[PDB]
RNA sequence: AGGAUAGUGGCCUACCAUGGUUUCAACGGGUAACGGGGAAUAAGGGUUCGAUUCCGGAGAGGGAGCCUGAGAAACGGCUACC
RNA sequence: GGUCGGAUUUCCAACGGGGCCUUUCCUUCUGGCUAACCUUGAGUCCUUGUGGCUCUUGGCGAACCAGGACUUUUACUUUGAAAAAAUUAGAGUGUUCAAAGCAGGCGUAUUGCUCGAAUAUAUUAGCAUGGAAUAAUAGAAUAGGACG
RNA sequence: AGGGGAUCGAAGAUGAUCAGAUACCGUCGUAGUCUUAACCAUAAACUAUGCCGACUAGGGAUCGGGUGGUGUUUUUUUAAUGACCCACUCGGCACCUUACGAGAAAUCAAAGUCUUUGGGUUCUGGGGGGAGUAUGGUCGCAAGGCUGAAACUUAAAGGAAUUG
């Protein structure tokens, strides 16, 4: 240490780092595209749902709310971005 | 931070550097203000109207999608409450703790919390008024702070 | 204004050595004094066109205005025609290079061509004793928002 | 709370510079900041500086050269006339041949050499030696 | 941080903190109450005339055994006894009693001088007359 | 509004209104306080003093009153008590 | 450079300024001394580096005096005047030196000339003046908004 | 003031001890100890270290939360889960080493970024006594609490460490 660049860090630092403490904090959440077995309907959710989001078809469950990331119901298929 | 307590928490929200996103958001912008309008007839605050909008649909932040922010676009569509979202919540809270204290008169602790409580609401109609969004003299009574709240 | 009983107290109220002579009928049927305030400021409207006697106007009465030209927030409008104002200012202390916070409430008599609110800020212009504690008239109403029709509650 | 933004830069400034680093992080990186470090570099007490310009305040990257002795804010801004800035140099200065002390006048943020020059005077804003 | 404000506006705190301080120091205290002016055997006087009243020997204290020769006198301007000192050796047959003497301090303002208790002045002139110049015989005490 | 003054002015009189000052210290108490120019000490910042040769003020034992007079509530002017 | 390390220059280095341009404010008529002339019917000869170019027909005059289709408020800071005199800092001045004081000096004493008696500082308040960094204050959000 | 009143126990009774013991020790023992409705508002109420904010050092733990896993696990001996292991992270009670720094030292990751002295702010102190007393005010039913001197007296009092 002593000299450092805190221009270009290195990104396995920036992945271990807290969102608020990099370089320039951005969120690290992300968004899913997900398929209920039901309907063919795509649909959006976000990643830390925090709600019970349910699908036009089939409108009982489609994620489960937790503490942090939503926890997918296992009847169903999902996609990142 | 906590100018209530002596925690020293962040958990904040990083919204992104981009502020025009997500580049894979298809949905016209004037499907999302009659998608909040719908919300706001239906009776939903603007916080939990944003929850939802972002779980339910993909707008990140309806800032960021649409040119107005939330508040914004139900007070320009005629919705917007008599009193402030965070406000009327922190009336609320303290007519249950008042309401608690009318039976649990040796509750020394919700005591404690109430004068808490309700100092920060007078902390917070002090803003409203002082910027105009209150009407001046505007006062918490905690005595018809239960018809405030009903 | 030019309602509301102008002459209402015991004795005839109008201004000295003005001859409404009620013989010649003119187009207007009345003559009215006025005058400039000088150093800039304006005759109002009102005074022009008002029908109240206050002698004691800069405009309408004989007082004159000379020496300091002061301004300052109104604070009180309880008493009849004059209202007192709060010069706030700085008060330097040389020994610790540091300055605190001082006022004086100012008493200054106001003309009724002018309307005035608590909050508001007035210039007011030095003239002669025209009571125990007022020295200063007002001349100009410097309200341009008012901070007062913003505040109502919406529908 | 921060109350004085200038004061937390330099103070971590100074820190980075006592400790030996070669560069230093500064934040929120005000442009009263960012003008006080441009009259440092010009007479050399710092080097390049790059901002980083996330959406909220900025940040500044400085990287210093180890001859920088201390640079600190004169809180409040006094007020400082003509005839006072030889006084607030003689105290704040180590020497009389070299050394500066910033000030904000209605002509920029300045020292107080070129300061001099210009005539000009104004509120007192640190030190840098 | 220092625990005082520092603000341009903070200037009335400063002189409001600063002057109720100053009450802590001896000599500011004195000075603003008036204390030798009410409550001082002198009225804030560097000398003041006295009666003798009585000759009485005080004993030296601690480490210092000896006996101090002072005398018990009365002041004529604001009828006060005090007890002074007479500096040198002998002297006491140059005071009787009921004469006039001449007082002033020890030098120590207050805080008994030295192994004396209870004596904060001293005789400096006698019926009139310097009392180092009749302890060298330069002059004659008056037979009065 | 009137009287009084040389004149503005609650200066005073009569009528009407309930006002005016204050924690940014009103009000009250003390001052062994006449104010300023200034004196000592003084690296800077400051501490204390200023009854006293210049300016301003007040008084001629303390109050009150008044004539003469441009100008006095005079005092080496007058009227009254103590 | 006939000018014994000695007494510079529109070739210029850096300083402290002003004006103009780049989307850049100076709100607006009132009258003319004809904008630091964006007009050369005519024309002033210093015999070929480059700053001493005449009577100029007008031709769009903000570098100017009050009627307002003229006013965001300060704080701060620069400059200017006033801040009695004496005292203080300080120039001149053999009271024999000195404290001092504001005098004195010079002719051939033929019957006379002359220098002075400066200067700077003297805050905080008030008045103009240049600046718009720093610090505060206000505006168009149900437009009761500006522009003719 | 009412209720409760097992145990222990200011007062007290009492047996020892002692030169005396109305102290330590032993046997009991009233008020208290508990509760309700009101008082009081003080503790070495202590980390003898105000609150907020930034930076400055090297570790292994541990509490709560979240993220990830060429991970384990009892169930389906290859599904959530839950519990563990490993790697980060945020906040917390703290620890160990070293002080580059600080301090008079003990020692301190703050008691550091301090004569190279200024991030914001509140409170407190000016040698020891007299004295937390007098007096005045205020609160309490009291006990007492808060505020709070002076006269006078004195060359020391006190902190940390060394040797005996």
Redesign the pocket.
Same mark, same amino acid.
């Given at each position: 240490?002593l000299v450092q660049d805190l221009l270009h860090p290195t990104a396995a630092s920036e992945?271990?780092?807290? %969102?608020? %403490?990099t370089l320039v904090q951005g969120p690290?959440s992300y968004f899913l595209d997900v398929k209920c077995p039901g309907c063919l309907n795509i649909t959006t959710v976000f990643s830390?749902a925090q709600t019970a989001v349910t699908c036009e078809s089939c409108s009982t469950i489609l994620c489960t709310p937790?503490?942090?990331?939503?926890?997918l119901s296992?009847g169903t298929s999902f996609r990142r971005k | *931070?906590?100018m209530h307590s002596? *925690?020293?928490?962040?958990?904040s929200s990083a919204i992104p550097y981009s502020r025009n996103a997500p580049a894979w958001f298809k949905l016209s912008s004037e499907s999302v203000i009659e998608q909040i309008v719908k919300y706001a007839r239906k009776g939903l605050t603007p916080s939990q109207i944003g929850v939802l909008l972002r779980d339910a649909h993909g707008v990140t932040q309806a800032r960021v999608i649409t040119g107005n922010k939330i508040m914004?676009i139900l007070?320009?569509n005629?919705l917007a409450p008599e009193i402030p979202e965070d406000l009327y919540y922190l009336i609320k809270k303290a007519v249950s703790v008042r309401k608690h204290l009318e039976r649990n008169?040796?509750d020394k602790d919700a005591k404690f919390r109430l004068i808490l409580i309700e100092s920060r609401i007078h902390r917070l109609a002090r803003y409203y008024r002082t910027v105009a969004v209150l009407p001046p003299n505007w006062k918490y009574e905690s005595a018809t702070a239960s018809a405030l709240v009903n | 204004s030019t309602e509301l009983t102008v002459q209402s107290?015991? /004795?005839?109220? $109008?201004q000295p050595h003005i001859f409404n002579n009620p013989k010649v009928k003119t187009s207007k049927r009345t003559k009215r004094w006025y005058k400039?305030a000088g150093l800039?400021?304006?005759?109002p409207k009102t005074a022009i066109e008002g029908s109240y !006697?206050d002698?004691?106007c800069p405009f309408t009465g004989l007082v004159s205005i000379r020496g300091?030209?002061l301004?300052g927030t109104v604070?009180?409008?309880?008493?009849?025609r004059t !209202? &007192?104002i709060?010069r /706030?200012?700085?008060?330097?202390i040389? $020994?610790?290079?540091r300055?605190?916070?001082?006022?004086?409430? &100012?008493?200054v008599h106001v003309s009724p061509a002018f309307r005035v609110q608590v909050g508001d !800020?007035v210039t007011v212009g030095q003239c002669?004793?025209?009571? $125990?504690? &007022?020295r200063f008239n007002v001349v100009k109403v410097?309200a341009? /928002?008012?901070?007062a029709? $913003?505040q109502? /509650?919406?529908? | 709370?921060?109350?004085?933004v200038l004061?937390?830069?330099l103070?971590?400034i100074?820190?980075?510079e006592?400790?030996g680093?070669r560069q230093?992080?500064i934040?929120p990186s005000?442009?009263?900041i960012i +003008?006080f470090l441009q009259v440092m570099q010009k007479h050399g007490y710092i080097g390049e500086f790059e901002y980083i310009d996330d959406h909220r305040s900025g940040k500044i990257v400085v990287q210093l050269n180890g001859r920088l002795?201390?640079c600190?804010?004169?809180?409040?801004?006094?007020?400082? +006339?003509?005839?006072?800035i030889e006084?607030?140099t003689?105290?704040?200065l180590?020497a009389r041949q070299f050394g500066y002390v910033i000030?904000?006048?209605?002509?920029?943020?300045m020292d107080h050499e070129?300061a001099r020059? +210009?005539?000009?005077?104004? +509120?007192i804003?640190?030190?840098v030696? | 941080?220092?625990?005082?404000?520092?603000?341009?506006?903070?200037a009335?705190?400063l002189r409001?903190?600063r002057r109720?301080?100053?009450?802590?120091?001896?000599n500011?205290?004195?000075?603003?109450?008036?204390?030798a002016?009410?409550?001082?055997?002198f009225g804030?006087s560097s000398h003041a005339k006295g009666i003798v009243l009585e000759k009485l020997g005080i004993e030296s204290?601690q480490p210092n055994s000896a006996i101090r020769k002072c005398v018990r006198v009365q002041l004529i301007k604001n009828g006060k006894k005090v007890t002074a000192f007479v500096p040198n050796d002998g002297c006491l047959n140059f005071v009787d009693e009921n004469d006039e003497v001449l007082l002033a301090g020890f030098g120590r303002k207050?805080?008994?001088k030295?192994?004396?208790?209870?004596?904060?002045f001293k005789v400096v002139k006698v019926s009139g007359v310097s009392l180092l110049a009749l302890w060298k015989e330069k002059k004659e005490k008056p037979r009065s």
């Open positions: 240490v992945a271990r780092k807290h %969102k608020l %403490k690290r830390h937790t503490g942090g990331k939503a926890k296992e | *931070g906590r002596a *925690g020293k928490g962040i958990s914004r007070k320009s005629g008169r040796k | 107290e015991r /004795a005839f109220q $109008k400039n800039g400021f304006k005759t !006697i002698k004691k300091k030209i301004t604070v009180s409008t309880k008493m009849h !209202i &007192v709060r /706030a200012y700085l008060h330097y040389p $020994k610790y290079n300055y605190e916070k001082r006022h004086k409430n &100012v008493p !800020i002669r004793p025209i009571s $125990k504690t &007022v410097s341009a /928002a008012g901070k029709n $913003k109502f /509650a919406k529908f | 709370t921060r109350s004085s004061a937390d830069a103070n971590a100074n820190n980075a006592k400790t680093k230093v992080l934040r005000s442009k009263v +003008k002795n201390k600190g804010v004169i809180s409040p801004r006094f007020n400082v +006339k003509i005839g006072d006084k607030w003689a105290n704040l180590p000030l904000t006048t209605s002509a920029g943020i070129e020059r +210009k005539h000009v005077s104004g +509120k804003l640190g030190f030696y | 941080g220092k625990g005082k404000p520092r603000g341009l506006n903070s009335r705190k409001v903190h109720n301080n100053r009450w802590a120091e001896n500011y205290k004195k000075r603003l109450l008036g204390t002016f009410k409550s001082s055997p804030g204290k207050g805080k008994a030295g192994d004396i208790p209870g004596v904060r």
